[PDB]
Amino acid sequence: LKKLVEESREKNQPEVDMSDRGISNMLDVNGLFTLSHITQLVLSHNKLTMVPPNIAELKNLEVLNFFNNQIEELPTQISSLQKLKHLNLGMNRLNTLPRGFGSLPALEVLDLTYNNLSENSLPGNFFYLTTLRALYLSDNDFEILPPDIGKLTKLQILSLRDNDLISLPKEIGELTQLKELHIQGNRLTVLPPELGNLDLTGQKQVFKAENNPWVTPIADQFQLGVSHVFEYIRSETYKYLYGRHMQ
Amino acid sequence: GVPICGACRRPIEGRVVNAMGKQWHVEHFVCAKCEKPFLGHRHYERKGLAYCETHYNQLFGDVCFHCNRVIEGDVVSALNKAWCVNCFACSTCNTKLTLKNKFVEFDMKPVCKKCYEKFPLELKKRLKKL
Ligand SMILES: [Zn+2]
Ligand SMILES: [Zn+2]
Ligand SMILES: [Zn+2]
Ligand SMILES: [Zn+2]
């Protein structure tokens, strides 16, 4: 660990890879927080249980990867990374996000796959992250997805695979940039008609929605195809049916 | 003697257009998509051919998933997405990759073999069934 730090500043390596190095504490990484010049830091597959506020000193980080650790909480300072574009917090033990986490001004890709997160885990300003184009919330404990999801207008990818969702917010229909929507393995029974305003039938687009207790006609339309689903959820009969299901 | 067209391969006598090193008849200097001539309008070179303003935007506007910029070099197409040659890497360890590498699809993201080997057992067992 004392060899990847000394070599990085004299030869000016912008990317640092310390994956699978048995690191349990970033402070034990000799001279790590003096590398203010780095733009990418990979600490995946280690034994971190927390992230120190010293992470704020690495102000030029553009890619930050904490995949597969045991991180239980994050410092507020995590939102001070002005140049941060990619943040991978996948496969950890997070059930909360720090205060003002949504203050990240340049975040494009946020991966929160496989944690212990629900809607209550999100801070009030979480949906200030309007620069996001990819948000992965797969394998979590979301029962209800907040309507403010509609505020992420630049979102192209949204994954809610294997959660505890009983319903989808209609505000998802406001995501005009969406290419991928992953909602398999939930407890969804009906789809909001507003979703019909979107079109995910393209060859470059993705709509996976298996393993859900869909109502019979929706299941039939799925057996027919995605185009048939989107065409069906736009229909008047289905609007009336939806209105009856809500009441 | 006189410059010769590179499209129909015949001598010119009148107006000589000059583009991409080769000379061109004005009516024979055309876009590769729509057979419309440029006739003075700006062309857009791409690996040897030229296109009009819109077609080039349509068929060369692949955007890198990593750096979120328009790819100028060779494009790597995988999992309904595109990467730059120097940007394509594992989504879990950021190790550079090629299509000749054996990665797995995870929510339409590339994951290197080693990383997927490091995945939890229940997750992999559930992913088998998907
Ligand atoms: Zn000619
Ligand atoms: Zn054209
Ligand atoms: Zn790129
Ligand atoms: Zn990997």
Numbering used by the authors:
A (entry chain A): 5 to 251
B (entry chain B): 189 to 318
What does the paper say about this structure?
Ras suppressor protein 1 (Rsu1), a leucine-rich repeat (LRR)-containing protein conserved from human to worms, was recognized as a major FA component and is important for FA formation and cell motility. Among the IAC components, tripartite integrin-linked kinase (ILK) associates with another two key players PINCH and Parvin to form the ILK/PINCH/Parvin (IPP) complex, which acts as an essential platform to recruit many proteins for the FA formation and signaling and provide a linkage between FA and actin cytoskeleton. Here, we solved the crystal structures of the Rsu1/PINCH1 complex and found that Rsu1 strongly binds to PINCH1 through a large concave surface on its LRR solenoid. The cellular data supported the inhibitory effect of Rsu1 on the IPP complex.
We prepared the Rsu1/PINCH1 complex by combinatorial usage of the purified fragments that contains the elements necessary and sufficient for the Rsu1/PINCH1 interaction and successfully obtained the crystals of the Rsu1ΔC/PINCH1_LIM5C and Rsu1/PINCH1_LIM45C complexes. The complex structures of Rsu1ΔC/PINCH1_LIM5C with one crystal form at 1.65 Å resolution and Rsu1/PINCH1_LIM45C with two different crystal forms at 2.2 Å and 3.15 Å resolution respectively were determined by the molecular replacement method. In the Rsu1/PINCH1_LIM45C complex, the nine LRRs of Rsu1 form a curved solenoid capped by the helical regions in the both N- and C-termini, named N-cap and C-cap, respectively. The N-cap consists of the α1-helix while the C-cap contains three α-helices (α2–4). Although lacking the C-terminal half of the LRR-motif, LRR9 remains folded presumably due to the presence of the C-cap. Consistent with our biochemical finding, the LRR-solenoid of Rsu1 interacts with both the LIM5 domain and the C-terminal tail (C-tail, folded as a α-helix) of PINCH1 through the concave surface of the solenoid, mainly formed by the parallel β-sheet and the flanking loop regions. In all three complex structures that we solved, the LIM5C fragment in PINCH1 and the LRRs in Rsu1 showed the essentially same conformation with the overall RMSD of ~0.3 Å. However, the LIM4 domain in PINCH1 adopts different orientations as observed in the two crystal forms of the Rsu1/PINCH1_LIM45C complex, indicating the intrinsic, structural flexibility between the LIM4 and LIM5 domains.
